[PDB]
Symmetry: C2
Subunit: 188 residues, 2 copies
Amino acid sequence: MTRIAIALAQDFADWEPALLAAAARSYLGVEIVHATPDGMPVTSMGGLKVTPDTSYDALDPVDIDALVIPGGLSWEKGTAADLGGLVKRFRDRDRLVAGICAAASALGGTGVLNDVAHTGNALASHKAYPAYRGEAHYRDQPRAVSDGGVVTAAGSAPVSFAVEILKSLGLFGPEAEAELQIFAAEHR
Amino acid sequence: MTRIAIALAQDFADWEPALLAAAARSYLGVEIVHATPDGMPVTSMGGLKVTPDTSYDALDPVDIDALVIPGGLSWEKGTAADLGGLVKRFRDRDRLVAGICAAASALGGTGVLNDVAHTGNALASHKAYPAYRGEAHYRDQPRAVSDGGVVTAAGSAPVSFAVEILKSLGLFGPEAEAELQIFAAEHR
């Protein structure tokens, strides 16, 4: 069985982790662990008051298969959490790490994007971080990218972000594909 | 001041009210009131433990411009809230009522779809409710429908659901369109 940690924060982007968590948990039998930087409740961009299971510091990769980090306003408000140690903790156990929107650029700041293909909201967004050394690997494309156990996406790409995470986890069978392929039709 | 009530429930579909709430509240200056049937917490399909602001019976249309009902599993689980009184309260005040996915068929069960153009997950989903007498007006199309102060959509159409709610409220300006137009690109 698969366990995914979703690292929430104040002003998290409601639409970014939603389809992944709802489909994984309710359709695919995945356990979802929600965490916040200090283990206390946070309020999403859309005003949802959410109580997490745990804090970032308590997350243990020993039995969590993936770390998924949604974007949101904390970065631009100057209150973003320190993800460096948390990302390294998961990488050290060769777990999937996924970041979307502002959190993709925060991943760049950890160094984890230095050596793998990736994307984000914009290359300039990643380059704002001095530790980001991954510029040659950035791919300016609309859909999520998955490479080397790291999945990244722009905040405009929540569906492919979900698909790539599930694919990477070996969970993208017919049920998963049936539930996630339905979102394109309203854009035709 | 525009205020939108979002009527959550146990096992609500995380991806359905997310874009609307986040964009409205964070970008467009809209106040979001989240409610559950008994006013106490509920758990989304994705496992979010959400503490709402209030209960359904405290929602007063004198003060609230729109009632937005996400779908989710309560209907299929046979534990859904009775929406008839709440919907009538809002409709009688000529407030927008919007329902997506299973909640669109639940709105059909109140009779509110009898006289307006609408859509849903499928015509047969609406027909499962004996009070639904709107078959002549059902639109089998991928995008949300807005007519007569009622907005409906399939669960696969969260973006157009949000856009039609915002248009109904006279809030779909250049800022709204810019935040909401970005989701098509990942589908080609």
